[PDB]
Subunit: 236 residues, 4 copies
């Protein structure tokens, strides 16, 4: 258990984390530069090796962090991320070559301020799941109806449940929903608007109400906590 | 009144509701699958019967639920929905064939968490009705003016009160409002912008103010309830 | 002063207001119907007279309301509106023929619930004026720069301060800002994005902050009022 | 130190500030007018001199304000702005000719109400910096992936990290994201949607959560301050 503390003091040291971050930033610049064909024609060889080096150092770092953290490591979402993303970069040189750039998100996992933002942002999601489920069901149903109503005459937009899903998502963002989709549809189906206006109403109303209910239920909790605090003093 | 309790204990049983939901989910998968011509060519016959079965079971379920709930059933919005949607699926094999997929919304009526979301979301609507009335009047008036101003030269977009309504709704979502509608209009009516900018201002200002007044009047009520609670202790 | 009370009791009577509203709604239907060339070919003559009648009754009503309310009438925004809108409908049979439909907004002036909505919605505006002034200055400045930078090569979108104003408003609503304006601009002015991205950032940031500051300064006032209430009891 | 107070009483006088503002507004009108080729053909000479005069007066004003405020001047963001913007207008008659119009923002620096708005609006930014950093990293990463995935076949939209950045910004504003970018992409890359839908989800979710967290953390502070106030009285 000597070498253990020895490594642990490295793995936990301020310097170690700083080094890794330094590499993250270095490699991030490198991956931008590798985007230029010009740059690659001249320095591609060097950069490719720098990637291999960084990826080796990260593998080593993951290995050390597992030895130090043991099981706790795989119960830690940030370390899992670091793990999965380094592992991707390990598969021998398709889509995976491009997914190697995901290692730059380690800058989030390695910077405490970033973690906190991401954690804060993510933390709202658990309470949204049933509204998401509801909307997903809503899309599913509409997608099925839209495939049946319009897929024969408008196969690109609705020929298939998946295409209908896609188009409905496009309608929800309001992108070209009328000039691009519903007006062409109405040239064959004069009542297409009876399908898409209500669809647009639900989806936009649900989105707004989701934002409203977050703010207001938040403040209600702030109000409750305050109330208890005030009540205690009055009680006391 | 024996058979009544007998049925009631079925209709109210955990298992019964679970079965029905199980069917809802089963049939939901089925209706997705029926979307593939491939899938239908092979298994269409089986699926069509599964639909008939599910629809029979649901009819039976509605009948039992009415016998058990009696009048209370038709005073219950969820049961009415379940009723209307199963009934649609009953009309003999137009639009109605597609509206059969609406039976998948029974997953909302049958899942308590879904009910609560939908109830919460719906509950804001009663207080919005006069703002909706106001906006509807606003559209109506603008639609009439737009038909008169532009319908002769731009019949597709404004030739008819209903087309003007449609286009105005499109303008409100901001979809291609300028490149698609107002710039072409301005090639004949240089002052078309004097009609649509203000229109855009009202409608977007009303939408935002509607969201603002929901949040803030909500918190004011939270503030009032808190105040009373605090005051009582101070009074006591 | 007898006939005065006599008229006043009419003008103030529940029935009188109800009659006028009844006409507003009647005439509103009529103006929709007059939108159909079919309908006009058959009943245009009758409708035209019904408009004249309604407009006469409204003139009479305004006259009575002035005699009853005297000066107070012209200090009342709703009555001024009713006045200006009936007056428009008086100018002998251009744009004015279409502005006659504005008389249907009297349904707002005559329905107390509508007044309250409109008053509530309008009431936020006084505090927005300096932000509006700021943004207007912002547009003005950008419009001038955009005219100078792009008006020679892109006259339709920027050839004139007014066209630049229009296009900038379009950019603010995000309507086709890239595919329709900035990408074409960038084919001649590769750095057009340095002008429009920041412009888009300011305008969207100002809009959001305007909404945020309304909600939060509202709640701060709600908080202050509550505080005082609670403090008094504690003081007492 | 006599002439110092002499000047200081000028530079600080109500009249001086009023004069400068008067010029700002005058020159603002002038710069609008200079936008018309017609207007310039007739009065361009006069206007050009009026610009030179105003710019001289402003230079003089800056010089006096520095003599009066000394070092404090260059520690003052508003004066720095006034400085930088007048200085631009000094470079001898490219882009700089157009940037001279930026001097009209001195109306903001010189009007206390405007300052306060701008200060209020700006004040939220310090707390947003890490979320901005996060998003910027997010764009950077996506931009790199999009360049690699799509730049060869779609060079205008993704051929270069900078073009990908631009397109991704366009996608974030939702402008033609589907009809204009992703549907064309999907004709070659059927799974392009797996890249852009999630991208759209993150960016819109982060934007909304940023607004939500501003409102709610604001109210939490309002709640805390109120609590302390109430607690003191109870304590007292
Ligand atoms: C509440 C959560 C709802 C979640 C719904 C998510 C479903 C997403 C399915 C997307 C399908 C994408 C594939 C596609 O579009 O084309 C494949 C075939 C038609 O093509 P093809 O077979 O070539 O003719 O089309 C099909 O493959 C039909 C796919 C049917 C699968 C349905 C499974 C969803 C279960 C949801 C059940 C809940 C209902 C109460
Ligand atoms: C607050 C409310 C937010 C909204 C909640 C969710 C709303 C629905 C989102 C739908 C997303 C759009 C899905 C989509 O684009 O289609 C994906 C596939 C279609 O696959 P495909 O057949 O390949 O067609 C793609 C187009 N094509 C033919 C030209 C290649 O079809 C599918 O299989 C996708 C089925 C839906 C899966 C995604 C829905 C659940 C994920 C929810 C995300 C929230 C997590 C934070
Ligand atoms: C809440 C959910 C609302 C869902 C209901 C949406 C109904 C409107 C959708 C729609 O327009 O579908 C059109 C169908 C199809 O028949 P239809 O529009 O009457 O014309 C078919 C023309 N032809 C011969 C070229 C095929 O028929 C109709 O829509 C007629 C109504
Ligand atoms: C405050 C709530 C306002 C609610 C307004 C909702 C009105 C929606 C009507 C939509 C009309 C759709 C039919 C359409 O556009 O074309 C039919 C004809 C013209 O076609 P055509 O006859 O073939 O020549 O055009 C017409 O049919 C003329 C339709 C006139 C009906 C007007 C009834 C609305 C009553 C609102 C009165 C309140 C005003 C104070
Ligand atoms: C918070 C504010 C939200 C906004 C409140 C409402 C704003 C106004 C919504 C207007 C909805 C758009 C209506 C529309 O698209 O036109 C429907 C018909 C026109 O029928 P049509 O003559 O068939 O023309 C359709 C286009 N065409 C010719 C190519 C087939 O013309 C009509 O007859 C429709 C008349 C209006 C009916 C809908 C307005 C009342 C429902 C409000 C929904 C709120 C409930 C939650
Ligand atoms: C802070 C509030 C700012 C409010 C700004 C509102 C100004 C709106 C002016 C819109 C001009 C529309 C007419 C137009 O675009 O074309 C007319 C000529 C060029 O055409 P042309 O003469 O035919 O060559 O172009 C012109 O007529 C030039 C117009 C110059 C008038 C400038 C008056 C605005 C005073 C704002 C001064 C505050 C600056 C500190
Ligand atoms: C919360 C922030 C909200 C934003 C605050 C205001 C932002 C700026 C709004 C600008 C509105 C757009 C103005 C516009 O479209 O151009 C109007 C004229 C141009 O006249 P024109 O030369 O006829 O060109 C029109 C296009 N054309 C050549 C094809 C016919 O050019 C002008 O003369 C208009 C000059 C601006 C006047 C409107 C700005 C002050 C009104 C603010 C409204 C708020 C009141 C609630
Ligand atoms: C905060 C406000 C920011 C305002 C600054 C915006 C600057 C970018 C706007 C822009 O792209 O204007 C382009 C100007 C014009 O010269 P330039 O873009 O260099 O090319 C002119 C090409 N030619 C020969 C066909 C005329 O020149 C340049 O922009 C070059 C930089
Ligand atoms: C967290 C903050 C992230 C901030 C990222 C901001 C980066 C913005 C760079 C925009 C590049 C614009 C120039 C461009 O697109 O084309 C130039 C070349 C390709 O053209 P070419 O060389 O002609 O082939 O393409 C290039 O020049 C490649 C540019 C690579 C520079 C990368 C520097 C960003 C450092 C961020 C490192 C953090 C990662 C953890
Ligand atoms: C609340 C979340 C808000 C979002 C936070 C930031 C999100 C990312 C914003 C990205 C802005 C878009 C940048 C952009 O359009 O590209 C600029 C250059 C590309 O240069 P370039 O190679 O010239 O290509 C331009 C297009 N072209 C080829 C046809 C001329 O590529 C670059 O070099 C730009 C690299 C990014 C710089 C801007 C990001 C940091 C500034 C954040 C602003 C917030 C301050 C309040
Ligand atoms: C309104 C719906 C549920 C509708 C049904 O019910 C959803 C929207 C997202 C959820 C909020 C977030 O999760 C953040 C936070 C979690 C706390 O734990 C409770 C407070 C708060 C604000 C949640 C309450 C909100 O209401 C939830 C239940
Ligand atoms: C501002 C306007 C009315 C304008 C006029 O007045 C509308 C917008 C929607 C309505 C709100 C929702 O109904 C939810 C909830 C119902 C409670 O009962 C009272 C509180 C709250 C937040 C309502 C107050 C809000 O103000 C209403 C009256
Ligand atoms: C933030 C800016 C001013 C920025 C500078 O300062 C603007 C935005 C619109 C204004 C609000 C509305 O007027 C409604 C209401 C009026 C009350 O009287 C005070 C409270 C409240 C919420 C106002 C405070 C808000 O802050 C104002 C001053
Ligand atoms: C949620 C994130 C941080 C996420 C991580 O953490 C960002 C969003 C913008 C920031 C707000 C603004 O700066 C205005 C104001 C400054 C005060 O000083 C504290 C309160 C308030 C409302 C800030 C708290 C908010 O939470 C910050 C930290």
């Amino acid at each position: 258990s000597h070498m253990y503390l020895r490594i642990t003091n490295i793995v936990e040291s301020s310097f170690f984390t700083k080094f890794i971050i330094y590499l993250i930033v270095l490699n991030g610049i490198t991956m931008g530069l590798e985007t230029s064909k010009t740059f690659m024609q001249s320095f591609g060889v060097y950069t490719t090796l720098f990637n291999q080096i960084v990826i080796t150092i990260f593998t080593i770092e993951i290995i050390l962090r597992i030895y130090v953290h043991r099981i706790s490591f795989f119960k830690d979402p940030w370390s899992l991320f670091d793990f999965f993303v380094v592992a991707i970069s390990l598969v021998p040189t398709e889509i995976l070559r491009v997914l190697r750039v995901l290692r730059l998100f380690r800058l989030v996992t390695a910077v405490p301020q970033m973690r906190k933002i991401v954690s804060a942002l993510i933390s709202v999601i658990p309470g949204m799941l049933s509204v998401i489920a509801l909307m997903t069901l809503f899309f599913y149903i509409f997608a099925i109806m839209a495939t049946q109503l319009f897929g024969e005459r408008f196969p690109e937009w609705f020929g298939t449940l998946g295409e209908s899903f896609y188009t409905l998502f496009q309608v929800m963002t309001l992108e070209s929903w009328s000039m691009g989709i519903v007006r062409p549809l109405m040239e064959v189906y004069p009542y297409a608007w009876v399908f898409f206006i209500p669809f647009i109403f639900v989806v936009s109303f649900v989105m707004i109400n989701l934002v409203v209910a977050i703010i207001v239920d938040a403040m209600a909790i702030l109000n409750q906590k305050e109330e208890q605090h005030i009540i205690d003093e009055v009680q006391s």
